[PDB]
């Protein structure tokens, strides 16, 4: 029982919150892009803003030590 609990908890923690890849993705609503007749040229700047926000959120999350609490 103890070994099973430890192994399952460890693998669940390492899978649900991978250390390398982002565990969440902020996606620009292409539906809104079509609805507002947005120019596809700005999507590069929008993607840059989105990735900056994504890394900022991940850094702030890791600051408060969420891994141990999640485990």
């Amino acid at each position: 029982g103890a070994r099973g609990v430890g192994h399952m908890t460890s693998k669940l923690a390492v899978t649900l919150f991978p250390t390398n890849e982002h565990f969440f993705k902020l996606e620009i609503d292409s539906l809104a892009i079509l609805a507002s007749d947005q120019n596809p040229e700005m999507i590069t700047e929008f993607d840059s803003a989105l990735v900056k926000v994504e890394q900022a959120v991940m850094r702030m999350f890791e600051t408060i030590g969420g891994r141990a609490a999640m485990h």
Partner: protein, 141 residues
Amino acid sequence: LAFAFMLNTAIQRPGERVTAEEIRYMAQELDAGISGLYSILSRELQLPLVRRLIHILRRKRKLPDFPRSEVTGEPLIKEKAVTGIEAIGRGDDRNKLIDFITTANQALGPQAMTQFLNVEEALRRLAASGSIDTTNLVKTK
């Protein structure tokens, strides 16, 4: 019990060699065995946590407010939760895109670079992708 609790010990079969493809097969079995738990946890924990995190971040005035839809009012940017094989193979998705590009280049050759599949120009933007800024090397336009 060992098979149920998804340990690695019951996987090994005494007596004879096991191929890499076989091991991948039973690893697929193990990842499949707790799919319901991964799904419910992804629905319950990952998404509200990130929403609360982003709300706190915005209230701190550390990043300006998200644009809202004119027609509906919903934020123009939403969220998604990645679990398990999806997280393992986001790199595989990147590899699939790059392999499609490479296969097209092989099929068409030097003459490829004309009118279907873009050669994707690597100096500026992917330096700004995954953070970091452009320029430095970049002889600006």
